[PDB]
Amino acid sequence: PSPPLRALYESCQFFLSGLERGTKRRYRLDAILSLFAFLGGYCSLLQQLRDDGKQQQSFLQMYFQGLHLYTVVVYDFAQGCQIVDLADLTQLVDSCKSTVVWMLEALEGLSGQELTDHMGMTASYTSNLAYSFYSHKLYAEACAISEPLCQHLGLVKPGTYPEVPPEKLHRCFRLQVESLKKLGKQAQGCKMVILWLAALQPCSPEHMAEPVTFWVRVKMDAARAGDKELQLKTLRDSLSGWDPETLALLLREELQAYKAVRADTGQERFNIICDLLELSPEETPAGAWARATHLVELAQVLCYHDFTQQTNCSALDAIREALQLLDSVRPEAQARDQLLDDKAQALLWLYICTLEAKMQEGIERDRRAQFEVNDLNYEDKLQEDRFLYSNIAFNLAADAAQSKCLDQALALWKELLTKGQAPAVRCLQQTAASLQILAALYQLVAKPMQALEVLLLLRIVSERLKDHSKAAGSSCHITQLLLTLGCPSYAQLHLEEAASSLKHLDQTTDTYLLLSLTCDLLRSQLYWTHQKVTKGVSLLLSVLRDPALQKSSKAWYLLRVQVLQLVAAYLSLPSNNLSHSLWEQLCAQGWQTPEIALIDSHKLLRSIILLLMGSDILSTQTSFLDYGENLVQKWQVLSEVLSCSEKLVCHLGRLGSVSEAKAFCLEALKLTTKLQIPRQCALFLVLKGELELARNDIDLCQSDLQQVLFLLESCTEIPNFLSHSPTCDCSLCASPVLTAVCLRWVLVTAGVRLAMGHQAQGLDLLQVVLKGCPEAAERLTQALQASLNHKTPPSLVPSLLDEILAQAYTLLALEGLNQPSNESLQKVLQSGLKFVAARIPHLEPWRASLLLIWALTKLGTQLFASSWGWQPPSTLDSICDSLSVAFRGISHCPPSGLYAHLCRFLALCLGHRDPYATAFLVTESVSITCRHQLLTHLHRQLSKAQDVPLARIQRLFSFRALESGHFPQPEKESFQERLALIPSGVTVCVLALATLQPGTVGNTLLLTRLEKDSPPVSVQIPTGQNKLHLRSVLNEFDAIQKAQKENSSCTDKREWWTGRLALDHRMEVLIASLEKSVLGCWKGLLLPSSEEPGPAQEASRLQELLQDCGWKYPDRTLLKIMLSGAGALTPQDIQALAYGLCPTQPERAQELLNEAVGRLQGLTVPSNSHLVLVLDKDLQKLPWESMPSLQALPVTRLPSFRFLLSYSIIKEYGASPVLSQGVDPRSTFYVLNPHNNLSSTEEQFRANFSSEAGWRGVVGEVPRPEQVQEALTKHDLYIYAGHGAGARFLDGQAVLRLSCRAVALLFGCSSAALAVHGNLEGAGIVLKYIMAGCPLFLGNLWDVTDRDIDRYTEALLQGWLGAGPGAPLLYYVNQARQAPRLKYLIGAAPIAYGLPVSLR
Ligand SMILES: [Zn+2]
């Protein structure tokens, strides 16, 4: 009784002493006995509460303390639970559940204060027990121990549990809801969430956020599980008789939660918005406000999903209704900050929906909208299409109205956010996201400065929202945009702000790593612009080797794209910077030239865009899944694609490849046509005009310029923009992109005028361009100063404006050469040289061009005649040094036209003083564009791979595979290593034309003979001093071709035949003039040497005497080569040699040479050998093979010297089977009469091609690409007799993809001919065939009139196919030229490309 109760105090003291002894002592199984003792004490406490009648508060506090001690002991036990004590924790939790039921009963009738104190202690004990149980994964036990609490909690009216701790209430509720979700209680979890909401009802909605989030989570789990009844059981029906305003707020919060989740939620949001519309009234301006907000949300939902049938409303109609409602609303002073940014969101989504409608309409419009003799210009015609009228259907004046919405939204948001006071908008998150989308859209439409304004505002929001990741992201974007414009200094402050803000994040999230990598990449870029390349390479290498760059995610892909662009920027630097050690480290990654990196970046961008919006946008032949960041990323990817295309087009146009540049330009034009943006269209049209100018197509360029003028006059809401003042605010002057387009327009117009011969107008226009560029730069500087407000004009602002000025200076100086008398522009060379010298590693090719102009100006002939040893019967030091420093500038990536001029001019200057250097320079000036294309093709093959022959071929062709030092020590070392690799018994001859004027054809021929174990031999032949110049021969050849075309179209055949005979006589005269008037006595350099001893002895003896005779440079090899053919030497050529080499005592030299020829007469036996001819773009047209002296030798022509070495490498690695085993006359595929325009050819060649062995053929129709595919890859002999080479079926790009393993006999009109458009190098299918690795290629050089090509084909085929086991094809090729009636008109057409090929 009372004494026992008094003893119960002593018992409690003893229990406290035991607990002190049991402190940190896990009772384990003895916890059960402790709980039994506690249950006895609880019975005693019930008896005391009966006796209590702080009468009972003291006993309640004692019981609470005992329960707290028991809870602490159970928490320790669960901390040391492991596998076993969990079972003991079950009994402990049963006892604790009995105690919790007792505590809940005691908490009843707690009146006040204790109702928040005793119930608070009960809640704390329950929370501790629940944490211990749930942490032990005892979901069922925790649910059982927590069921009594929330059940009565939720059931009780709002008065109960008043002002209870929301966190404590959340803690139990969150634990129970999480346990239900993990167990998948489904309905039970939803009802518990309902009780959670009911209990917390009298409070502000931020406390309701977590329940709502849990409701959305459980609903979406039901969604993955296929449940829909829960989704039907929405908040409206669930909450039932609740206050409508709270229900509307809860539905809005649920809508935002559904926007957050990463799943497709179109229908759920539609249901929520419809329910919001039903709840809202339409008799109160607050109702109008709610209706407008719901309408803009409905517009967001409908702008991407198709729900028209069940809504009977369009996005535009809904958004216009919302706009009218918003404009009608009269606000209240405290809530104006919501009407602002409500209007802004509405206008922005209006713009987005109108753009989407335009895109869909254009896609549908474009989708439903859908026999010349030579095929030289087939790919050009195929590339070109008719879409210029679409541009007229493109520049509608609705664009100003469309952009007005975005401008007004920006203005309203600026007014909202500028003021210092914290914004009162309910959700700043959505404002920040919409600001990001607006900035992306502004970038996409080529309005950069306005986009920067938005980004500054986004950072302001990040500070208010205290979210550190977005501050770093926005600062990185700001720095990237600032550097793209060309302001180096203003990038650094924002970069440092990003670096400072980066620190406040956990160092394990992907965000931290991505931001750190981006900042390091930006630092590397900033070093590149500030001449710190040495550590920039280190930073770039550390970024590249980092394994986290390869993680599969869309955010990392854009970082990879930017890294690739920076790699391309680094790969465009002269070898003086860095060092040898870092160069192969950089090249070891797998990118050897900037264009390779740019192409990889473009491919990555296309792959990214493929994953986001399908593929209908890019080309004509899924769902968007708006997810948050996807909306921003779409516009970002489109803008990046456009910028990458612009860079690629500019670089490829500069290099000298025009076909690829035109392809990229047309693709970009199509893309800009679909989106309906005139500003980008104008820039790409101007670039296309510039590309067309280089091909000499004046009218097409003029049409494109007219289109540019029409578009410029369309958006401006002799052209008028030339008269603008230096300072202006018009749309053309306010924006830098438009200013760049306008400045390019005048350059292209001046180029066209100069081409047409209208001089003195092009100079006038180019003066305008030169004057205009710096003033535009200064206006851009002022504009950037106003926006960013640092109030300090930042250093310099280099940009694309610099390149425009450089090219303008180049063209002005080049025009200066042709008119030497005008002093006013004779200082432009100096001015441009100073201007370029300022930016050394940025305008190097332009510096090289200006230096070449300076050298040719100082040229003022016999000036180069003291370096060679044959004269036809110090300034040099300065020219050599200047040309050397110009050569080292562009060696790493030379333009295809300036390199040849530099190389051949320097080779002329050096002369026989350094034979090795002269030979290297002459060899390094032929077929450079082919070398670039082969490097790109090799990279494509190697990338397809995931090899050793490919690696060695890459080393042989790379521009940087050499050591360091002076000029030309590494060049000579590499050249000697190449020379040691020459196959035996092969003599290589290079014929190139030395051009003085960099636009015309010269009159100097350079000849080089390269041989194994022999020093190189070089010589120069001037042809301007004698009649019958080289240009005379070229003009006569062109005249003969045009006369043949004229004579082809006639009716009477008498005149036809007479004209044909006269033309044949003219061609014979031309062929004779080639040998007897151009080469002269030096025909012997193209003949095989001698192996019998005795010519060497005679050469040595003659050398000793001729040294005294007056030979300025004595060479034994020259005499050996000339005397190896002593039999064919005529008296006149002997006189020419003696007079040229020996001007001191010509008479004695003539006598000695005559005696030497007499001694060597007869005892000459030239033997097996092979000659390779390397010709430049102008000499390739002439038939060198049909000279009388060369009509007895095997001759083939190759694009360059490195190709022979590549053939040797392939033969050593045993890839090519033809040059190892021999063309087998069993695998033949012939194409006869694709389109039936020929009749007699079929009749003649049908039987001759039918009755054979293994001759698969197709005759009558056009072969499908698969057949020719397998006929070129797998067969051995491919023959085509149709008109043209066949580019209609197998275009060059299809050929490049293959491996060529056959010999192609193309018997068509101009099959082997290379098209020379302007100053560009030759282009043809033969080049692609050689790139694919063709052992031999045969084709005609000029157009043929048929009926004699028949006889030539018959003779050649019969002879070579009936030869026998094995014979050289070149012998029968030379023997078959006598069959036709016209021996020089049709017999001289065929030529051979490749290496000699024989049968088994
Ligand atoms: Zn203006």
Side-chain angles (χ1 to χ4, degrees), residues 733-796:
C733 289
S735 186
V737 179
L738 273 190
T739 315
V741 181
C742 297
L743 275 181
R744 296 215 183 223
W745 190 88
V746 193
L747 253 171
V748 188
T749 301
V752 161
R753 297 294 182 69
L754 286 191
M756 261 195 288
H758 274 149
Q759 203 234 2
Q761 313 265 317
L763 302 190
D764 194 6
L765 294 211
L766 286 190
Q767 295 292 353
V768 176
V769 192
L770 206 155
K771 162 198 165 187
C773 285
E775 304 172 1
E778 201 45 60
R779 272 196 281 116
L780 186 62
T781 304
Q782 284 204 2
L784 266 180
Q785 204 49 78
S787 301
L788 243 189
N789 215 241
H790 311 177
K791 308 308 294 300
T792 310
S795 162
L796 293 86

XYZ file of all heavy atoms in Angstrom, residues 733-796:
470
model
N 23.074 48.419 -86.693
C 24.223 48.911 -85.940
C 24.202 48.465 -84.486
O 25.263 48.364 -83.861
C 24.286 50.438 -86.016
S 24.759 51.090 -87.634
N 23.019 48.201 -83.928
C 22.943 47.830 -82.518
C 23.465 46.421 -82.273
O 23.875 46.100 -81.152
C 21.506 47.956 -82.016
N 23.462 45.568 -83.296
C 23.840 44.186 -83.055
C 25.144 43.840 -83.765
O 25.383 44.308 -84.884
C 22.735 43.233 -83.527
O 23.027 41.892 -83.183
N 26.002 43.025 -83.144
C 27.288 42.709 -83.788
C 27.180 41.687 -84.908
O 27.944 41.767 -85.878
C 28.135 42.188 -82.619
C 27.139 41.631 -81.666
C 25.936 42.524 -81.762
N 26.265 40.721 -84.803
C 26.125 39.711 -85.852
C 25.683 40.358 -87.159
O 26.231 40.078 -88.236
C 25.145 38.610 -85.409
C 24.975 37.575 -86.508
C 25.629 37.957 -84.127
N 24.681 41.236 -87.084
C 24.216 41.929 -88.280
C 25.312 42.810 -88.859
O 25.452 42.915 -90.083
C 22.970 42.753 -87.960
C 21.638 42.010 -88.061
C 20.475 42.979 -87.963
C 21.566 41.215 -89.352
N 26.093 43.461 -87.995
C 27.197 44.284 -88.479
C 28.234 43.437 -89.203
O 28.778 43.853 -90.233
C 27.836 45.042 -87.318
O 26.812 45.614 -86.497
C 28.725 46.154 -87.843
N 28.520 42.244 -88.681
C 29.452 41.345 -89.353
C 28.926 40.935 -90.722
O 29.676 40.902 -91.705
C 29.712 40.116 -88.483
N 27.631 40.622 -90.807
C 27.048 40.248 -92.096
C 27.139 41.408 -93.085
O 27.506 41.223 -94.255
C 25.597 39.772 -91.912
C 25.005 39.364 -93.246
C 25.545 38.609 -90.942
N 26.816 42.619 -92.629
C 26.886 43.785 -93.506
C 28.312 44.026 -93.985
O 28.539 44.359 -95.153
C 26.341 45.020 -92.788
S 24.599 44.924 -92.332
N 29.290 43.865 -93.090
C 30.681 44.075 -93.474
C 31.147 43.022 -94.473
O 31.913 43.327 -95.393
C 31.569 44.078 -92.233
C 31.668 45.435 -91.536
C 32.575 45.357 -90.328
C 32.159 46.492 -92.506
N 30.699 41.776 -94.304
C 31.038 40.735 -95.271
C 30.417 41.017 -96.634
O 30.987 40.654 -97.675
C 30.577 39.373 -94.757
C 31.238 38.893 -93.489
C 31.400 37.390 -93.534
N 31.979 36.853 -92.311
C 32.925 35.925 -92.281
N 33.438 35.424 -93.392
N 33.366 35.487 -91.106
N 29.230 41.631 -96.643
C 28.550 41.920 -97.903
C 29.417 42.784 -98.811
O 29.551 42.509 -100.010
C 27.211 42.604 -97.626
C 26.327 42.729 -98.830
C 25.422 41.814 -99.280
C 26.258 43.837 -99.736
N 24.798 42.281 -100.410
C 25.294 43.521 -100.711
C 26.922 45.064 -99.818
C 24.978 44.384 -101.754
C 26.606 45.919 -100.854
C 25.643 45.576 -101.807
N 30.023 43.832 -98.251
C 30.832 44.740 -99.056
C 32.080 44.032 -99.570
O 32.520 44.264 -100.702
C 31.186 45.999 -98.244
C 31.737 47.077 -99.160
C 29.969 46.501 -97.492
N 32.668 43.158 -98.751
C 33.830 42.392 -99.191
C 33.496 41.507 -100.385
O 34.240 41.479 -101.374
C 34.363 41.544 -98.040
C 35.670 41.977 -97.383
C 35.918 41.149 -96.143
C 36.816 41.825 -98.358
N 32.379 40.780 -100.314
C 32.027 39.899 -101.427
C 31.655 40.708 -102.666
O 31.988 40.319 -103.795
C 30.902 38.932 -101.018
C 30.675 37.908 -102.111
C 31.259 38.234 -99.722
N 30.974 41.844 -102.485
C 30.665 42.702 -103.623
C 31.936 43.212 -104.289
O 32.039 43.224 -105.522
C 29.790 43.874 -103.177
O 28.582 43.374 -102.594
C 29.441 44.758 -104.360
N 32.918 43.632 -103.489
C 34.184 44.094 -104.047
C 34.903 42.971 -104.779
O 35.505 43.195 -105.836
C 35.068 44.666 -102.940
N 34.861 41.757 -104.229
C 35.465 40.629 -104.920
C 34.832 40.381 -106.276
O 35.526 40.166 -107.272
N 33.499 40.427 -106.332
C 32.800 40.224 -107.600
C 33.154 41.327 -108.593
O 33.384 41.064 -109.781
C 31.281 40.135 -107.364
C 30.521 40.382 -108.655
C 30.919 38.782 -106.790
N 33.200 42.576 -108.126
C 33.512 43.688 -109.019
C 34.932 43.579 -109.563
O 35.179 43.854 -110.743
C 33.311 45.018 -108.296
C 31.881 45.262 -107.865
C 30.952 45.429 -109.052
N 29.584 45.703 -108.631
C 29.185 46.824 -108.045
N 30.019 47.826 -107.824
N 27.913 46.945 -107.677
N 35.883 43.186 -108.712
C 37.250 42.984 -109.181
C 37.330 41.827 -110.169
O 38.098 41.880 -111.136
C 38.187 42.745 -107.999
C 38.540 43.960 -107.143
C 39.677 43.630 -106.196
C 38.905 45.141 -108.021
N 36.554 40.766 -109.936
C 36.539 39.648 -110.874
C 35.993 40.070 -112.233
O 36.515 39.654 -113.273
C 35.721 38.492 -110.301
N 34.947 40.893 -112.246
C 34.348 41.344 -113.497
C 35.205 42.356 -114.244
O 34.858 42.723 -115.370
C 32.966 41.946 -113.240
C 31.815 40.999 -113.514
S 30.239 41.860 -113.627
C 29.964 42.289 -111.912
N 36.303 42.816 -113.654
C 37.137 43.816 -114.279
C 36.792 45.244 -113.930
O 37.487 46.160 -114.387
N 35.743 45.468 -113.139
C 35.372 46.813 -112.703
C 36.254 47.222 -111.525
O 35.863 47.191 -110.358
C 33.895 46.873 -112.341
C 32.998 47.146 -113.507
N 31.714 46.654 -113.588
C 33.198 47.867 -114.634
C 31.162 47.056 -114.719
N 32.042 47.794 -115.372
N 37.479 47.612 -111.857
C 38.415 48.107 -110.860
C 38.046 49.554 -110.529
O 37.196 50.164 -111.184
C 39.847 47.953 -111.362
C 40.895 47.903 -110.265
C 41.986 48.931 -110.454
O 41.947 49.728 -111.389
N 42.970 48.918 -109.564
N 38.657 50.097 -109.472
C 38.433 51.455 -108.978
C 37.071 51.579 -108.304
O 36.749 52.623 -107.730
C 38.577 52.493 -110.097
N 36.267 50.517 -108.367
C 35.068 50.444 -107.540
C 35.275 49.469 -106.390
O 34.830 49.715 -105.260
C 33.867 50.030 -108.390
C 33.742 50.787 -109.702
C 32.813 51.979 -109.603
O 31.743 51.898 -109.002
N 33.216 53.094 -110.199
N 35.960 48.356 -106.660
C 36.304 47.430 -105.596
C 37.226 48.049 -104.565
O 37.088 47.800 -103.367
N 38.181 48.864 -105.018
C 39.029 49.592 -104.079
C 38.201 50.548 -103.233
O 38.423 50.673 -102.023
C 40.119 50.354 -104.831
C 41.047 49.526 -105.718
C 42.206 50.376 -106.202
C 41.549 48.307 -104.973
N 37.233 51.221 -103.856
C 36.364 52.135 -103.125
C 35.585 51.398 -102.042
O 35.445 51.891 -100.918
C 35.416 52.833 -104.100
C 34.728 54.034 -103.490
O 35.069 54.403 -102.347
O 33.844 54.612 -104.157
N 35.071 50.209 -102.364
C 34.313 49.438 -101.380
C 35.217 48.907 -100.270
O 34.841 48.894 -99.087
C 33.579 48.290 -102.075
C 32.472 48.643 -103.070
C 31.406 47.565 -103.062
C 31.856 49.998 -102.761
N 36.413 48.444 -100.634
C 37.321 47.902 -99.634
C 37.824 48.979 -98.685
O 38.060 48.688 -97.506
C 38.485 47.189 -100.321
C 38.097 45.836 -100.929
C 39.311 45.042 -101.378
C 37.267 45.033 -99.948
N 37.974 50.215 -99.167
C 38.256 51.322 -98.260
C 37.141 51.479 -97.235
O 37.401 51.747 -96.057
C 38.444 52.621 -99.045
C 39.659 52.647 -99.961
C 40.974 52.662 -99.210
O 41.007 52.784 -97.986
N 42.072 52.542 -99.945
N 35.890 51.304 -97.667
C 34.760 51.397 -96.747
C 34.850 50.311 -95.682
O 34.637 50.568 -94.494
C 33.430 51.321 -97.519
C 32.256 51.326 -96.556
C 33.320 52.478 -98.495
N 35.166 49.081 -96.092
C 35.279 47.985 -95.121
C 36.388 48.273 -94.110
O 36.213 48.109 -92.886
C 35.520 46.645 -95.839
C 35.336 45.488 -94.873
C 34.587 46.501 -97.016
N 37.555 48.691 -94.614
C 38.697 48.970 -93.750
C 38.378 50.082 -92.762
O 38.730 49.994 -91.580
C 39.912 49.343 -94.600
C 41.316 49.110 -94.038
C 42.312 48.945 -95.171
C 41.741 50.248 -93.127
N 37.718 51.141 -93.231
C 37.311 52.217 -92.336
C 36.285 51.733 -91.318
O 36.330 52.121 -90.145
C 36.757 53.380 -93.157
C 35.922 54.370 -92.375
C 35.066 55.202 -93.311
C 33.967 55.922 -92.556
N 33.028 56.612 -93.480
N 35.361 50.872 -91.747
C 34.228 50.532 -90.905
C 34.573 49.633 -89.735
O 34.020 49.795 -88.644
N 35.469 48.664 -89.941
C 35.674 47.640 -88.910
C 36.034 48.188 -87.524
O 35.363 47.810 -86.545
C 36.733 46.636 -89.388
S 36.157 45.478 -90.644
N 37.045 49.054 -87.356
C 37.367 49.523 -85.993
C 36.247 50.316 -85.335
O 36.071 50.246 -84.109
C 38.626 50.378 -86.208
C 39.179 49.931 -87.515
C 37.982 49.612 -88.345
N 35.485 51.080 -86.118
C 34.368 51.829 -85.550
C 33.290 50.893 -85.023
O 32.672 51.168 -83.989
C 33.796 52.787 -86.593
C 34.822 53.740 -87.171
C 34.280 54.539 -88.332
O 33.090 54.364 -88.669
O 35.041 55.342 -88.911
N 33.043 49.786 -85.728
C 32.120 48.777 -85.221
C 32.643 48.162 -83.931
O 31.881 47.929 -82.980
C 31.892 47.696 -86.279
N 33.950 47.889 -83.880
C 34.525 47.322 -82.664
C 34.341 48.260 -81.476
O 34.005 47.818 -80.370
C 36.005 47.011 -82.879
N 34.556 49.560 -81.687
C 34.422 50.517 -80.592
C 32.979 50.605 -80.100
O 32.729 50.724 -78.892
C 34.926 51.889 -81.031
C 35.307 52.794 -79.876
C 36.132 52.074 -78.829
O 37.227 51.581 -79.169
O 35.684 51.998 -77.666
N 32.015 50.563 -81.022
C 30.612 50.568 -80.619
C 30.265 49.323 -79.813
O 29.531 49.406 -78.821
C 29.707 50.687 -81.844
C 29.410 52.117 -82.253
C 28.232 52.190 -83.211
N 28.600 51.852 -84.580
C 28.137 50.801 -85.242
N 27.299 49.945 -84.683
N 28.525 50.604 -86.500
N 30.779 48.160 -80.224
C 30.558 46.955 -79.429
C 31.180 47.078 -78.043
O 30.597 46.610 -77.055
C 31.107 45.727 -80.152
C 30.813 44.387 -79.471
C 29.318 44.146 -79.396
C 31.497 43.248 -80.202
N 32.361 47.694 -77.950
C 32.988 47.912 -76.648
C 32.113 48.784 -75.756
O 31.906 48.474 -74.576
C 34.363 48.553 -76.825
O 35.168 47.736 -77.680
C 35.056 48.705 -75.480
N 31.589 49.881 -76.306
C 30.705 50.746 -75.529
C 29.454 50.000 -75.083
O 29.009 50.138 -73.935
C 30.324 51.980 -76.346
C 31.417 53.028 -76.442
C 30.867 54.412 -76.712
O 29.654 54.603 -76.800
N 31.757 55.387 -76.846
N 28.874 49.201 -75.982
C 27.668 48.452 -75.649
C 27.927 47.468 -74.515
O 27.132 47.360 -73.575
C 27.147 47.724 -76.889
N 29.046 46.742 -74.583
C 29.378 45.812 -73.508
C 29.661 46.543 -72.206
O 29.345 46.032 -71.126
C 30.576 44.947 -73.899
C 30.266 43.589 -74.524
C 31.553 42.853 -74.850
C 29.405 42.770 -73.581
N 30.257 47.734 -72.283
C 30.514 48.507 -71.073
C 29.214 48.926 -70.402
O 29.098 48.892 -69.172
C 31.366 49.731 -71.401
C 32.144 50.243 -70.215
C 32.883 49.130 -69.516
O 33.929 48.683 -69.977
N 32.339 48.665 -68.398
N 28.224 49.335 -71.196
C 26.955 49.765 -70.616
C 26.246 48.620 -69.903
O 25.673 48.812 -68.824
C 26.057 50.361 -71.699
N 26.270 47.421 -70.487
C 25.489 46.313 -69.944
C 26.075 45.795 -68.635
O 25.347 45.586 -67.658
C 25.399 45.186 -70.974
O 24.794 45.640 -72.170
N 27.390 45.581 -68.593
C 27.983 44.898 -67.449
C 28.325 45.866 -66.321
O 28.427 45.454 -65.159
C 29.222 44.121 -67.892
C 29.130 42.605 -67.709
C 30.470 41.941 -67.964
C 28.611 42.259 -66.323
N 28.526 47.142 -66.649
C 28.673 48.215 -65.669
C 29.924 48.093 -64.806
O 29.894 48.438 -63.621
C 27.433 48.285 -64.772
C 27.090 49.701 -64.364
O 27.087 50.033 -63.180
N 26.803 50.545 -65.346
N 31.029 47.608 -65.377
C 32.303 47.689 -64.667
C 32.929 49.070 -64.801
O 33.858 49.403 -64.055
C 33.278 46.618 -65.160
C 32.699 45.239 -65.216
N 33.406 44.160 -65.701
C 31.497 44.754 -64.824
C 32.659 43.074 -65.620
N 31.496 43.407 -65.093
N 32.439 49.875 -65.745
C 32.854 51.262 -65.927
C 34.352 51.401 -66.171
O 35.000 52.281 -65.596
C 32.436 52.102 -64.717
C 30.965 51.964 -64.345
C 30.055 52.215 -65.538
C 30.138 53.658 -66.011
N 29.738 54.613 -64.942
N 34.912 50.537 -67.012
C 36.302 50.656 -67.436
C 36.475 50.004 -68.801
O 36.422 48.772 -68.902
C 37.250 50.011 -66.423
O 36.954 50.492 -65.106
C 38.694 50.343 -66.766
N 36.665 50.786 -69.863
C 36.833 50.210 -71.207
C 37.909 49.141 -71.215
O 39.098 49.434 -71.022
C 37.241 51.420 -72.055
C 36.582 52.570 -71.375
C 36.600 52.256 -69.898
N 37.529 47.886 -71.436
C 38.451 46.775 -71.181
C 39.452 46.518 -72.296
O 39.084 45.991 -73.352
C 37.497 45.589 -71.016
C 36.366 45.923 -71.930
C 36.202 47.418 -71.871
N 40.720 46.865 -72.052
C 41.851 46.476 -72.892
C 41.536 46.518 -74.382
O 41.203 47.574 -74.929
C 42.328 45.076 -72.501
O 43.124 44.505 -73.523
N 41.640 45.368 -75.041
C 41.290 45.213 -76.443
C 40.069 44.312 -76.576
O 39.678 43.616 -75.635
C 42.459 44.626 -77.244
C 43.718 45.482 -77.408
C 44.665 45.309 -76.230
C 44.419 45.145 -78.715
